[PDB]
Amino acid sequence: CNETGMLERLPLCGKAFADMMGKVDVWKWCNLSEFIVYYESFTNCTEMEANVVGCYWPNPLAQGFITGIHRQFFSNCTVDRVHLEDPPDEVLIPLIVIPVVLTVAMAGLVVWRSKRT
Amino acid sequence: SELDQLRQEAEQLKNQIRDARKACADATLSQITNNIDPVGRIQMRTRRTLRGHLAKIYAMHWGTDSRLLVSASQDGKLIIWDSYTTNKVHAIPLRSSWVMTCAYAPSGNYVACGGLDNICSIYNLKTREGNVRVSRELAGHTGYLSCCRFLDDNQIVTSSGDTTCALWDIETGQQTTTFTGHTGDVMSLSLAPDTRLFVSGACDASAKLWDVREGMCRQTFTGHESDINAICFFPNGNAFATGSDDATCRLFDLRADQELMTYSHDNIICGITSVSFSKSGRLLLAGYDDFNCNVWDALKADRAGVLAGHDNRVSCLGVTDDGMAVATGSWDSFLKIWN
Amino acid sequence: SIAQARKLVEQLKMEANIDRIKVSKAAADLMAYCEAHAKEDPLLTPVPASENPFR
Amino acid sequence: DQRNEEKAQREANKKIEKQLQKDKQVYRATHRLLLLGAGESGKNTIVKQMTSGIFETKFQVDKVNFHMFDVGAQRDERRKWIQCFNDVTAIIFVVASNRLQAALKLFDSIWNNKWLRDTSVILFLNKQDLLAEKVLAGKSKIEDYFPEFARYTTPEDATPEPGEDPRVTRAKYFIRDEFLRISTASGDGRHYCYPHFTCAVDTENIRRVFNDCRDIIQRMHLRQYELL
Amino acid sequence: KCNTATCATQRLANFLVHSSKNFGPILPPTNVGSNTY
Amino acid sequence: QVQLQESGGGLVQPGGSLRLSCAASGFTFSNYKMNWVRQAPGKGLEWVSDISQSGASISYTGSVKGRFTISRDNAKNTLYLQMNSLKPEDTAVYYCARCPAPFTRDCFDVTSTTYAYRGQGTQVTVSS
Amino acid sequence: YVVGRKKMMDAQYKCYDRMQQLPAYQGEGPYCNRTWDGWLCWDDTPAGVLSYQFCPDYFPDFDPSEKVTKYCDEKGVWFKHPENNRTWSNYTMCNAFTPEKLKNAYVLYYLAIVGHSLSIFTLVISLGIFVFFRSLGCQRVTLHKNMFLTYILNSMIIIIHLVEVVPNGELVRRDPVSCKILHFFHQYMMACNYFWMLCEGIYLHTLIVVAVFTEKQRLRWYYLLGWGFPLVPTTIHAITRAVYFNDNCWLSVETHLLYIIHGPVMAALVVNFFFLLNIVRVLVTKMRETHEAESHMYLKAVKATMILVPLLGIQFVVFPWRPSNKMLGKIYDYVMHSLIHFQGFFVATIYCFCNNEVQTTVKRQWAQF
Ligand SMILES: CCCCCCCCCCCCCCCCC[C@H](O)OC[C@@H](COP(=O)([O-])OCC[N+](C)(C)C)O[C@@H](O)CCCCCCCCCCCCCCC
Ligand SMILES: CC(C)CCC[C@@H](C)[C@H]1CC[C@H]2[C@@H]3CC=C4C[C@@H](OC(=O)CCC(=O)O)CC[C@]4(C)[C@H]3CC[C@]12C
Ligand SMILES: CC(C)CCC[C@@H](C)[C@H]1CC[C@H]2[C@@H]3CC=C4C[C@@H](OC(=O)CCC(=O)O)CC[C@]4(C)[C@H]3CC[C@]12C
Ligand SMILES: *C(=O)CC[C@H](NC(=O)CCCCCCCCCCCCCCC)C(=O)O
Ligand SMILES: CCCCCCCCCCCCCCCC(=O)O
Ligand SMILES: CCCCCCCCCCCCCCCC(=O)O
Ligand SMILES: CCCCCCCCCCCCCCCC(=O)O
Ligand SMILES: CCCCCCCCCCCCCCCC(=O)O
Ligand SMILES: CCCCCCCCCCCCCCCC(=O)O
Ligand SMILES: CCCCCCCCCCCCCCCC(=O)O
Ligand SMILES: CCCCCCCCCCCCCCCC(=O)O
Ligand SMILES: CCCCCCCCCCCCCCCC(=O)O
Ligand SMILES: *[C@@H]1O[C@H](CO)[C@@H](O)[C@H](O)[C@H]1NC(C)=O
Ligand SMILES: *[C@@H]1O[C@H](CO)[C@@H](O)[C@H](O)[C@H]1NC(C)=O
Ligand SMILES: *[C@@H]1O[C@H](CO)[C@@H](O)[C@H](O)[C@H]1NC(C)=O
C-alpha cells in the first residue's frame, strides 16, 4: 500500500484529537471515562486513514503515530489496575496442601475419638 | 387293676359333669343378647405415651387411685408413672432383670415383682428415709413367677411355672396356703372384687376357681384348645374371661359352671397375651401377638374397636378402677394410655 | 402314679356335686349388670373433654 | 400450693431420667447370652471354666462386657420362659456328641420359634474327645441310630486336625450336618448358626463366643444399611 | 481451569454468565477470518 | 376338653405288624402338628415321629425309619402309626402327642415328663 | 454491542499504556515487536514461539475460556495470513464451538434446576418422616438428618445462584458484595455437603470394620467435621480470593485458588473410596463364610456398592477429571451433572423411601389413622 502518503494524512486527526482533549478537563485526562467517545472516534478515525491508502489497520508504522501522541499526552497516569493473578508456587502450594493435610488428619481424628468417648 | 379302675372312674365323673353342664345349657348368651343395641364403633385415641423403659415391658398394673401405675421391663427396672403428667415418680432397679410380673398394692404403699428368679419381691414406697428398698423376698416357688396380686398390705397370691399357686404372709414370709391341681405352667391369676376367690389360668388349657381361705379348687373350667395366657374377673364377680394361644377369648360363668361365649375371628391366628374388662363389663379388651388390641363386645361377641398404636407384641393391658383410661404395654418398650 | 389318679377322682367328686343354675339365668345377670352401669362407663360412654383427665 | 407439688414432681422426674441415661449406657454396652444345654451335655463345666431360678455369669473379653445366663430351677417345659430371651445376642446351645435326636428336636424348636426367629445360635458340639473313643472302639454304630450315616461322606470343605483319623472326622461332621440341615432349611437372613467342635475344658470357648458375637453384631449393622 | 468433578456446577455457571444466559441462535457469528484482526 | 385316646397295641411276635390309632377330640385337628412318642421300660420319653398339619412334611427317628409309617385323617380326627417288622427294641408305651400351639413350625415340650396335650398311651410289647 | 466497544477501547488504551510501561526487550536474539492488534495486546515474544492469550469478551459468541494464538516468524516478523498477506492473529477457537456449547449448557442448566428442585422436595419429605416418626430415631438416622439438611441447603443456594446471579448480567458488572457473600455461603454449604458424605463413610466404616461392638459414639466429632471444618478451606480461599484473584462475584474458575476448597473435598472423597473398598471386602467375606453361591454373591456385592455410591459420593472419585476430547466431554457432562444434581434425590430414595424399616413404620401409622 502507501507508506509515505499515509503518514501525512495522520496529523490531521492527530491535532484534531489535540483539541477535544483541550475542552475536557486537562487534569482529568487519565480517566478514560472523561473522553470515552472522543478517544473512540479518534480510533475509528485512524481506522480508515490507513484504509484509504489501502494499508490494513493496525500497521507497524501507524502504531508509532498512536504511540507518539500517547507519549506526550498520556504519561502522568497510573499503570496499575486489577491484576487478577495467582500467587507463586511458594505460596500457592502450601495454601492447597495444608487444608488437604488437615482434612486427612481431621478424618482420622473422628475415627479415633468417636468410639473413644 | 386299680390304675385302670381309677382312670375309668374319672371318665364316669367327667361324663357326669358334662351331662350336668349340658342340662343347664337351655339357651346361649348370643340368643339372649340378640336384641340388645350394639355399642357401635369404639375408636379410642392414644392420650399418653410413657417412654423410659430400655427393653420389652412384660407387665403393668394400675393403682387404686386411677392415676399412678407401675410397669416392669426386662432391663431390670420398675418405673412408677404419673399418667396425668407422664412424670416418673420412682425408678426401682431390680436384682434380677428377668421380671415377668408386677403388682400395685391397693393402699399404694407397696409394689411387687417377680420372674425367672422364682422370687416375689416386695418394695416399700413410703419409707422414712425416702429410698425405695426391698421389704421382703418371698421364696418357695420352684418355677418362674408369672403373676402376683395383693390382697392387702400383708397378703399376696402368686402363680408360678411350678404348676402351683400360693398365698403368702408378707411379714413372716411363709406360704400360708398352696393351691395345687394344675398340670401346666400357671400363667395368670385374677382376684375377685371381694378378694375371697381367685381364678388361675395355666398351660393345661384349663382354668380353676380357688377359695382363698379354704385353699381348695371349687370349679375347673375347660373349652380352650391351647395354653391360657391371660384371665380377668367380671366386675360383678360371677364370670371371668380367658385368653389363650388358640387365638380365642372365652367367657366363663361361675354359677352356670360352663362357657358362655367365644370371641374369635378367622383373620386372628395369633395368641392372646392380655385380657381386661371395662367398668361395666360391656367391653372385653384383649391384647394379641399381632401387635394389636381388639375391643370386643362382651355381650354380643362383636369386634367393637382396635388399638393399633404399638410396634411390637402387646404384653399387658389394664383398665383403671374408675374406667377412665386403658394402659397398654408392649415389647417395643412403650406404655400407652388410651381413652 | 396311683396317688395322682386317686386325687383326681376325689377332685371330680367335689366338682360334680355343685348346684348349677341355668345358662339363661346366668346370661341375664351379666346383661342386667351392664345396663345398670352403662352410664358410669367412660370407655362405653365417651366422657366430655372438659372432665377428661387425659385431655 | 399446687404449683409447689408440680415443680417438685418435675424435679424428681429430671433426677430419674439422669439415672436412666446412665443405665442405658451400661445396658446397651453389655451383651446378654442364654446358655442352653441337654441331658449331660457339659454346659456346667463350661460355666465352671468361666432356690435360684436363673444363674448369671459376667465376664470380659477385649474390654467387651458379656452377661451369660443359665437356667436353674425350671421345669422341662420351655415354651413359656424361653420367650424372655428373644433379645439376647446369641443362644449358646451345648450338645453332647438317643440324646442326640432329642437335641436335634430341641434345636428345631428354638430355630423355628416365632419369637426366636431373629436370635442367632452358637452351637457347641461338645464332648468331641468322647466321640472319638467311641468311634475308634466300634461297639455301637451310629448307623443303627442314623441310617443315613452309611451313605454319608466327609465334605471337601472339612478341616480335620491331622491327629484324628477319617472315621472320627466323618462322624463329627455328620452330626454337624444334622444341625446345619435344620438351620439352612429356615435361614432367610434373620439369624445364623455358628457350629463349633468343643471340649468342656477348652480355653477357646470364650474366644469362640466373642468371635461369633462380633459376626452377629456386624451382620446386624449390615442389615440396618440393607447391604446384606 | 479447575476441570474437577466438584467444579462442574461452577464451570456451568461461569460459562452462562459470560453468555449472558443466552440460549437463542445468535445472528451471523463474528468474523474471525482473514478480513479481521 | 382336649382328649387324646390311643388304641391298638398288644402282644406281637418279632417281625410282626401293628397299627396304632389316636382318636382326637376337643380341638381343631387340622390346625395342629401331631407327634408319636414312646417310653420304653426303665427309660425316658423318646420322640418317634411327627406329621405336619396337612401331612406333606413327615419325619421319623433313626431307629424306626423305613419300618414305621405315620399318617393322619383330618376328616376322622385320627392319627395312625403303622409299625412293620417290629423288633423287641420297640417294646414301649406309645403316646399320641399334640403340639401346644396351632399354626406353629416349632413343637415344644412334647417329650416332657408332664405334658398336658398327650394321651395316656397304648402298650406295645414285642416278644416271642 | 456498545458495551463491547467500551471494553475494546479501554483495552487499547491499556495496551499502549503497557507497551510504554514495559521495559525494552532484554534478550538480544530476534523477536516479534510489541503489537496491539484490533482486539488484544501482545508483548514482545521470541522467534518460533506461538503465544497464547485468553479470548476477549467483546462479542456474545466469544468464549473467554478459549485461547487466542499468534505466531512469530524465525525471521522476527509476526505471522502473515496467506490469503491476503496480512498480519493476522488466530481468533478461530473463540466462537468455533460456542453455539454447540451453548446448546449443551442450556440442557445442563435445567437439568440442575430440576435435579435440585426434585431433591429438595424428596429430602424435605424424607426429613419430615425421620422427624415425625420417633421410632425410626437412632444414631444412623441422626446423621442422615444432617446429611439431608446439607443437600437441601446446598440445593437452595444453587437454585438461587442459577436463577438470580447467572441471568442477571448487570448484577455481575456492578459486582456487589452481596454477590461475593452468596458465593462464600455457596462454597461453605458445598463443602459441608461433601464432608457430611465423609461423615457417613466414617460412621459406616466404624460400625462394620473398626468398632463393631460400640453401639453409641460421640456424634460431636461428626458435627465438627461436617459443619465446622468446612469453614477452614472456605475462609482461606475467601481471603486469598479477595487479595490475589478478586473478580466479579468470584465466578472465575481459571484461578488455581479454587483448589483450596476442591482439594480438601477430593481428599475427603478419596478416603470415602477406601472405606467403600474395605466395606465391600467385609461384605464379600460374610457371604463366603455362609457358603453363598458365586452368582448371588456378585449381585449382592454390586447392589451394596450401588446404594453406597450416592451416599459416599464415589462418582466424584471414579470420574474426577473431565476429558479434553469433545465428544467424550459431552458424555461426561451429561453423566456427571445428572449424578451431581440428582444425588440428593437418590439418597432420599434409597435411605428413606426404599428403607424397609421406614416402609413398615409408615404403613402401620397410616393404617391406624
Ligand atoms: C422420578 C425421576 C427421577 C430421575 C432421576 C435422574 C435420572 C436421570 C436424569 C437425566 C436423564 C437424561 C440425561 C441425558 C439428557 C440428554 C439430553 C438430550 O441430549 O437433549 C435433550 C434436550 C434438548 O436437546 P436440543 O433439542 O438439542 O436442545 C436445543 C437447545 N437450544 C434450543 C437452546 C439450542 O432437552 C430437551 O429434551 C428438554 C429441555 C428441557 C429439559 C431438560 C432436562 C431436564 C431434566 C429432565 C429429567 C428430570 C427427571 C425425570 C422427570 C421427573
Ligand atoms: C447460609 C448459611 C448462613 C446457613 C447456616 C446454617 C447453620 C447455622 C445451621 C444449618 C444446619 C444446622 C445444624 C443442623 C443440625 C444440628 C444437629 C443438632 O444436634 C442433633 O443431634 C439434633 C437432631 C437430633 O436430636 O438427632 C445440633 C444443631 C446442629 C449442629 C445445627 C446447627 C446450626 C446449623 C449448622
Ligand atoms: C457463617 C456461615 C458460614 C455459617 C457458619 C456456622 C458456624 C459459625 C457455626 C454455626 C452453628 C455451629 C455449630 C452449632 C453446634 C454444634 C454441635 C456441637 O456438638 C455438640 O453439641 C455435641 C452433641 C453430642 O455429641 O451430644 C459441635 C459444634 C457444632 C457443629 C457447631 C459448629 C460451628 C457452627 C456450624
Ligand atoms: C434465565 O432467564 C432463567 C431464569 C428462569 N428460570 C427459572 O425461573 C427457574 C425456576 C426456579 C425453580 C424453583 C422451584 C423450587 C421448588 C421446590 C419445592 C420443594 C418444596 C418441598 C415440599 C413442600 C427462566 O426464564 O427459565
Ligand atoms: C441461604 C442464605 C443465603 C443468604 C444470601 C444473602 C445475600 C445478600 C447479602 C447482603 C449483605 C448486605 C449487602 C449490602 C450492603 C450495603 O450496601 O449496605
Ligand atoms: C459470613 C461471611 C461473609 C463473607 C463475605 C466476603 C466478602 C468479600 C468481599 C471482598 C471485597 C474486596 C476486598 C479487597 C479490596 C482490595 O484490597 O482491593
Ligand atoms: C464467617 C466468617 C469467616 C471468617 C472470615 C472469612 C473472610 C472474611 C473477609 C474476606 C476478605 C478479607 C480481606 C482482608 C484480608 C487480610 O486480612 O489480609
Ligand atoms: C487422601 C489421599 C490424598 C488425596 C489427594 C488428592 C489430590 C487431588 C488433586 C486434584 C488436582 C490438582 C490440580 C491438578 C492440575 C495441576 O495443577 O496441574
Ligand atoms: C458410576 C459409579 C461407579 C462406581 C464404581 C464402584 C467400584 C467399586 C469397586 C469395589 C471393589 C471391591 C473388591 C473386593 C475384593 C475382595 O474382597 O474380594
Ligand atoms: C485421586 C482421585 C482423584 C483426585 C485427583 C483429581 C485429578 C483427576 C484424576 C487424574 C487426572 C488429573 C490430571 C491433572 C493434570 C496435571 O497434573 O497436569
Ligand atoms: C482413587 C483414584 C482413582 C483414579 C481413577 C482413574 C482416574 C483416571 C484419570 C485420568 C484418565 C481419564 C481422563 C483423561 C482425560 C484426558 O486424557 O484428556
Ligand atoms: C441413573 C443415573 C444416570 C446418570 C447418567 C445419565 C446420562 C447418561 C446417559 C444418557 C446420555 C448418554 C450420552 C449421550 C450422548 C449424545 O447425546 O450423543
Ligand atoms: C520494532 O519496530 C521499530 C519501528 O521503528 C523498528 O525500528 C524495530 O526494528 C522493530 N523491532 C523488531 C521488529 O524487533
Ligand atoms: C505475501 O507475500 C508472499 C511472499 O512474497 C507473496 O508471494 C504473496 O503474494 C503475498 N500475499 C498476497 C496475497 O499477495
Ligand atoms: C487457527 O487455529 C485453528 C485451531 O486452533 C487451526 O485449525 C487453524 O489452522 C489456525 N490458523 C492458522 C492460519 O494457523
Side-chain angles (χ1 to χ4, degrees), chain A residues 29-32 35 39 43-44 47 56-58 60 62 66-67 70 74 77 82-88 91-92 95-96 98-100 102-104 106-111 113-115 117, chain G residues 5 9-10 12-14 16-17 19 35-38 84-86 195 198 202 205-206 210-211 214 216-218 221-222 224-225 229 232-233 236 240 244-247 254-257 259-260 263-264 267-268 271 275:
Chain A
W29 274 359
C30 289
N31 192 31
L32 182 103
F35 58 109
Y39 192 62
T43 323
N44 301 46
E47 276 283 6
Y56 299 106
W57 194 93
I66 304 317
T67 300
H70 215 267
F74 304 105
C77 309
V82 275
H83 266 177
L84 252 67
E85 193 216 310
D86 281 351
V91 191
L92 177 59
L95 284 168
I96 301 176
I98 287 187
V100 163
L102 294 180
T103 295
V104 182
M106 198 73 183
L109 201 60
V110 176
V111 182
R113 293 242 61 90
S114 60
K115 44 151 271 193
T117 66
Chain G
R5 184 59 66 101
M9 289 301 79
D10 54 53
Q12 183 169 347
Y13 183 77
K14 273 171 171 122
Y16 285 93
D17 214 63
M19 290 187 293
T35 169
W36 157 261
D37 61 50
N84 52 339
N85 198 286
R86 173 182 184 172
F195 270 89
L198 176 64
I202 294 177
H205 185 260
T206 297
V210 179
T214 305
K216 180 165 176 302
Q217 310 180 202
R218 294 192 305 177
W221 293 100
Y222 298 97
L224 187 55
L225 176 61
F229 187 80
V232 167
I236 298 176
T240 57
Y244 289 103
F245 208 103
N246 193 20
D247 50 303
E254 305 293 332
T255 172
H256 285 347
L257 295 173
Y259 291 117
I260 303 173
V271 171
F275 284 154

Side-chain angles (χ1 to χ4, degrees), chain G residues 154-323:
Chain G
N154 177 74
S155 281
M156 284 180 176
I157 296 177
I158 286 177
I159 286 178
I160 292 173
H161 190 269
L162 289 182
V163 167
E164 297 303 303
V165 178
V166 168
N168 210 13
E170 61 106 39
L171 189 70
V172 183
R173 269 185 292 277
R174 287 191 278 103
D175 191 0
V177 183
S178 66
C179 212
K180 307 187 188 303
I181 293 178
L182 180 68
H183 188 76
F184 182 88
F185 287 136
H186 171 52
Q187 291 177 318
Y188 166 77
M189 198 55 58
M190 178 199 64
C192 287
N193 189 231
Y194 290 119
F195 270 89
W196 266 105
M197 302 174 192
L198 176 64
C199 291
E200 294 271 7
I202 294 177
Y203 179 80
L204 182 56
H205 185 260
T206 297
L207 264 194
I208 308 299
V209 182
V210 179
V212 178
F213 280 104
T214 305
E215 200 64 33
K216 180 165 176 302
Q217 310 180 202
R218 294 192 305 177
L219 299 187
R220 60 191 66 175
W221 293 100
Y222 298 97
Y223 300 141
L224 187 55
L225 176 61
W227 297 111
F229 187 80
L231 271 182
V232 167
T234 312
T235 294
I236 298 176
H237 169 273
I239 292 173
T240 57
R241 202 71 185 263
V243 166
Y244 289 103
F245 208 103
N246 193 20
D247 50 303
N248 297 340
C249 296
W250 290 354
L251 287 163
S252 165
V253 292
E254 305 293 332
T255 172
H256 285 347
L257 295 173
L258 275 184
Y259 291 117
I260 303 173
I261 297 180
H262 296 271
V265 159
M266 286 305 303
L269 296 168
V270 164
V271 171
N272 259 350
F273 184 78
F274 287 107
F275 284 154
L276 173 66
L277 300 186
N278 209 12
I279 288 162
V280 171
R281 180 192 65 82
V282 173
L283 173 85
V284 167
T285 299
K286 292 285 178 287
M287 295 184 300
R288 292 188 186 271
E289 291 171 346
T290 50
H291 301 285
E292 182 116 339
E294 270 156 349
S295 99
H296 301 297
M297 282 180 37
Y298 300 153
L299 185 271
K300 291 268 298 302
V302 172
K303 172 183 173 56
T305 301
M306 281 309 154
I307 72 176
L308 288 179
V309 160
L311 182 71
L312 310 185
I314 305 300
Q315 72 269 23
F316 299 96
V317 187
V318 295
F319 309 131
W321 203 251
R322 186 185 188 276

